[PDB]
Design an enzyme around this catalytic site. Structure first.
Site, short mmCIF file in Angstrom:
data_model
loop_
_atom_site.label_atom_id
_atom_site.label_comp_id
_atom_site.label_asym_id
_atom_site.label_seq_id
_atom_site.Cartn_x
_atom_site.Cartn_y
_atom_site.Cartn_z
N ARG A 1 0.85 -1.19 0.00
CA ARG A 1 0.00 0.00 0.00
C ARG A 1 0.89 1.24 0.00
O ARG A 1 2.05 1.19 0.41
CB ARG A 1 -0.96 0.01 1.20
CG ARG A 1 -2.16 -0.92 1.04
CD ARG A 1 -3.10 -0.89 2.27
NE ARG A 1 -2.46 -1.43 3.48
CZ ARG A 1 -1.85 -0.69 4.41
NH1 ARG A 1 -1.78 0.63 4.30
NH2 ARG A 1 -1.30 -1.28 5.47
N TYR B 1 -1.28 -3.67 -6.91
CA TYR B 1 -1.08 -4.43 -5.67
C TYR B 1 -2.34 -4.46 -4.80
O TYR B 1 -2.96 -3.43 -4.59
CB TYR B 1 0.11 -3.92 -4.84
CG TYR B 1 0.06 -4.45 -3.42
CD1 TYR B 1 0.50 -5.74 -3.12
CD2 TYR B 1 -0.48 -3.68 -2.39
CE1 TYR B 1 0.43 -6.24 -1.82
CE2 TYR B 1 -0.56 -4.17 -1.10
CZ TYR B 1 -0.11 -5.45 -0.82
OH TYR B 1 -0.18 -5.94 0.47
N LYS C 1 -9.99 -2.96 1.50
CA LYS C 1 -9.69 -1.83 2.36
C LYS C 1 -10.49 -0.60 1.99
O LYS C 1 -11.00 0.11 2.86
CB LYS C 1 -8.20 -1.45 2.31
CG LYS C 1 -7.21 -2.54 2.71
CD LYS C 1 -7.47 -3.09 4.09
CE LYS C 1 -6.34 -4.01 4.48
NZ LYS C 1 -6.58 -4.72 5.76
N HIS D 1 -10.98 -3.12 11.25
CA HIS D 1 -9.83 -3.89 10.83
C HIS D 1 -9.61 -5.06 11.80
O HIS D 1 -8.61 -5.08 12.55
CB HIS D 1 -8.60 -2.98 10.75
CG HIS D 1 -7.44 -3.59 10.02
ND1 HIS D 1 -6.14 -3.17 10.23
CD2 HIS D 1 -7.38 -4.55 9.07
CE1 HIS D 1 -5.33 -3.87 9.45
NE2 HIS D 1 -6.05 -4.72 8.75
N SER E 1 -1.71 -4.30 10.08
CA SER E 1 -1.35 -5.18 8.97
C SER E 1 -0.05 -5.91 9.29
O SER E 1 0.87 -5.32 9.86
CB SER E 1 -1.21 -4.38 7.69
OG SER E 1 -2.43 -3.70 7.42
N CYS F 1 0.60 -8.08 11.58
CA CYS F 1 0.87 -8.23 13.00
C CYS F 1 0.14 -9.40 13.66
O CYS F 1 0.03 -9.46 14.89
CB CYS F 1 0.59 -6.92 13.74
SG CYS F 1 1.65 -5.57 13.21
N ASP G 1 -9.42 -10.28 8.55
CA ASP G 1 -9.06 -8.92 8.16
C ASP G 1 -10.11 -7.86 8.47
O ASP G 1 -9.80 -6.83 9.06
CB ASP G 1 -8.67 -8.87 6.67
CG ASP G 1 -7.89 -7.62 6.30
OD1 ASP G 1 -7.03 -7.21 7.10
OD2 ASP G 1 -8.14 -7.02 5.23
N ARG H 1 2.44 -12.49 -0.85
CA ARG H 1 1.09 -12.87 -0.44
C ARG H 1 0.61 -14.21 -0.99
O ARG H 1 1.07 -14.68 -2.03
CB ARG H 1 0.10 -11.78 -0.89
CG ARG H 1 0.32 -10.40 -0.28
CD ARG H 1 -0.25 -10.36 1.11
NE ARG H 1 0.23 -9.22 1.87
CZ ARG H 1 -0.39 -8.72 2.93
NH1 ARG H 1 -1.53 -9.26 3.33
NH2 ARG H 1 0.11 -7.66 3.56
#
Ligand SMILES: Nc1nc2c(ncn2[C@@H]2O[C@H](COP(=O)(O)OP(=O)(O)O)[C@@H](O)[C@H]2O)c(=O)[nH]1
Ligand SMILES: [Mn+2]
Ligand SMILES: [Mn+2]
Length: 608
Positions: free
Chosen positions: A72, A221, A230, A250, A272, A274, A297, A391
């Protein structure tokens, strides 16, 4: 895929046609979400050299991206609103860069669009993706239409959302308009890197809540390009939630089953990269306990008329960080990604499989590697074989642990909300809030070391209130006030609020807590507290488990004392920084109750 748009209802057709007028694509295709469509998209991408097959597995594919388009870009992500104060708190008086969202005026936004989008799809197809967030269904499922010039984005959207026939049948005036382009019209004037179209210097991820619109340019991406995720499900939705009496967060959602057979559901806000995915599909190291995945998420939450906080996962797949994934850390992810999965920026093995730091898939001797750069790579090289933010993108129905209720339209009842981030020192393994207002304060006070998920120097310790810093869709002060008001709901059965830290570092220099499956030991204590068990002692920062009510059996190397540091100097410094942070970045938009809780902490600290 079809050339007929006649199946789209009027409002959706109108949007597609104006996007076609602006971008000037070579042709226009409606996506249907079918198996045959998927195959045709895969073939086309292999031709372009964007996808590479992974014959070791069942229908898995690898993409490699331009090194400039790997995460991002928060500094190029904006909120477009008539009034700045609706988007963000007052600009920091000390003049530093805004830390809670980037406002852009409607006039600045229109200019930005006119400089990027006209003819941007020349020589490319425009794909029309009708999609649904939540079962379509449901409700409160929310529908959208994404247009894009990227087959990679089409394929990823098909995995991550519902596309698109049961979606077409429900679609009306009521939907998000999502406009995306990689921003590289054909013919190219300069070559691509790794056949990956992108325009890094021109990237713009814009959100226009009052128009129910998202406009994304220059990046392929995930976080920038999967607009339902998001952009819609957090940024646009959080603004909708605030005005309609719900929450868009989130947060992972999971189910915990105790040895007694009791099941409770919990939500957890981690920034993100974590630990959300690894927790949501954890295989517990305590065999008397069972975990079920609902989502990893995004959570949409609303009080029902029973006063219970009900949560749904609006997504259909997992877009998970690959490095670290193994049969040790996440065997459920390993089972999930074995088929029908798109990998981005991981290593390719000579046996036709994938590689990243941590992977323990049995491999033959003499197996060689090519890095995410597409160049030969060897154990010993300066850089990792896989990008740190590489990913997997896999459908959730391939996870073996999915909660029986994961796509239940009613949602699951949430009895605990858990905040956490990466903190190397000072912050204990687990703390329970003294109550709602205090837990909202803990959420607001969250700080976490920067990861590879965006453009920030990895390791930089950053404020990330509610793990929502990059994802606010409106004034973050007002978001806090919304959380405060939520707890005042008459007769609400409030979840208990907690704060965790998996990432304390020892001396020297490893992690104090083994984490992964061992995180079930923490969830067990939390579940106990939900049940109302007398298993906590008070500290200046909240409740912690009594030594002996936290199961450390089978962890002989792990000391309770190191897990629960409580140092006056650390917390004095923390209070100072929080005071500084709130003042600079929230200013007058900081709710009084948050400041009141800071004052409470400073007072408890005075007692130490
Ligand atoms: N040390 C440690 N690392 C973890 C833990 N949980 C996840 N990770 C790692 O942190 C990175 C991000 O994990 P993930 O669960 O995908 O983060 P998410 O983006 O929040 O869902 C991965 O490399 C994981 O292996 C944990 O409990 N302890
Ligand atoms: Mn996330
Ligand atoms: Mn992840």
């Amino acid at each position: 895929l079809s050339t007929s748009l006649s199946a789209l209802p009027a409002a959706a057709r109108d949007f597609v046609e104006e996007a076609v007028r602006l971008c000037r694509p070579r042709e226009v295709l409606l996506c249907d979400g079918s198996e045959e469509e998927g195959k045709e998209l895969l073939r086309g991408l292999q031709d372009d050299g964007v996808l590479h097959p992974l014959p070791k597995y069942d229908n898995c594919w690898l993409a490699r991206t331009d090194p400039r388009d790997v995460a991002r870009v928060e500094s190029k992500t904006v909120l477009v609103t008539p009034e700045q104060s609706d988007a963000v708190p007052p600009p920091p008086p000390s003049g530093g860069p805004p830390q809670l969202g980037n406002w852009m005026s409607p006039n600045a936004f229109q200019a930005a669009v006119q400089e990027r989008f006209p003819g941007c799809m020349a020589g490319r197809p425009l794909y029309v993706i009708p999609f649904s967030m939540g079962p379509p269904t449901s409700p409160l499922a929310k529908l959208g239409v994404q247009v894009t010039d990227s087959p990679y984005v089409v394929l990823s959207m098909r995995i991550m959302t519902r596309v698109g026939p049961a979606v077409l049948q429900r679609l009306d005036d009521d939907f998000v308009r999502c406009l995306h382009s990689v921003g590289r019209p054909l013919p190219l004037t300069e070559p691509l890197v790794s056949s990956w179209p992108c325009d890094p210097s021109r990237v713009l991820v814009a959100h226009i809540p009052s128009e129910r619109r998202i406009v994304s340019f220059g990046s392929g991406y995930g976080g920038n390009s999967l607009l339902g995720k998001k952009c819609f499900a957090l940024r646009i939705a959080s603004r909708m939630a605030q005005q309609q009496g719900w929450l868009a967060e989130h947060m992972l959602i999971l189910g915990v089953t105790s040895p007694s057979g009791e099941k409770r559901y919990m939500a957890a806000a981690f920034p993100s990269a974590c630990g959300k995915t690894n927790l949501a599909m954890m295989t517990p190291s305590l065999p008397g306990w069972r975990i079920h995945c609902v989502g990893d998420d995004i959570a949409w939450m609303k009080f029902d008329d029973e006063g219970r906080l009900r949560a749904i996962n609006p997504e259909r797949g997992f877009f998970g960080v690959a490095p670290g994934t193994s049969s040790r850390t996440n065997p459920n992810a390993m089972a999930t990604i074995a088929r029908n999965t798109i990998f981005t920026n991981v290593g390719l093995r000579s046996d036709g499989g994938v590689y990243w730091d941590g992977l323990d898939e049995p491999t033959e001797p003499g197996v060689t590697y090519t890095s995410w750069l597409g160049k030969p790579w060897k154990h010993g090289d300066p850089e990792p074989c896989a990008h740190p933010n590489s990913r997997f993108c896999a459908p959730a129905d391939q996870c073996p642990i999915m909660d029986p209720r994961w796509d239940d339209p009613e949602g699951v009842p949430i009895d605990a909300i858990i905040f956490g981030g990466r903190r190397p020192r000072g912050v204990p393994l687990v703390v329970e809030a003294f109550g709602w207002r205090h837990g909202v304060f803990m959420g607001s006070a969250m700080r976490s070391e920067a990861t590879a998920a965006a453009e920030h120097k990895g390791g930089r310790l950053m404020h990330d209130p509610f793990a929502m810093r990059p994802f606010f869709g409106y004034n973050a002060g007002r978001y806090l006030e919304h959380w405060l008001s939520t707890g005042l709901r008459s007769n609400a059965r409030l979840p208990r609020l907690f704060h965790v830290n998996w990432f304390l570092r020892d001396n020297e220099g490893r992690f104090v807590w083994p984490g992964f499956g061992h995180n079930a030991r923490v969830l067990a204590w939390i579940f106990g507290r939900i049940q109302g068990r007398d298993t906590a002692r008070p500290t200046p920062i909240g409740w912690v488990p009594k030594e002996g009510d936290l199961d450390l059996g089978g962890l002989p190397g792990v000391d309770y004392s190191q897990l629960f540091p409580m140092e006056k100097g650390f917390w004095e410094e923390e209070c100072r920084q929080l005071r500084e942070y709130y003042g600079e970045n929230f200013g007058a938009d900081l709710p009084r109750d948050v400041m009141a809780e800071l004052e409470g902490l400073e007072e408890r600290v005075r007692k130490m």
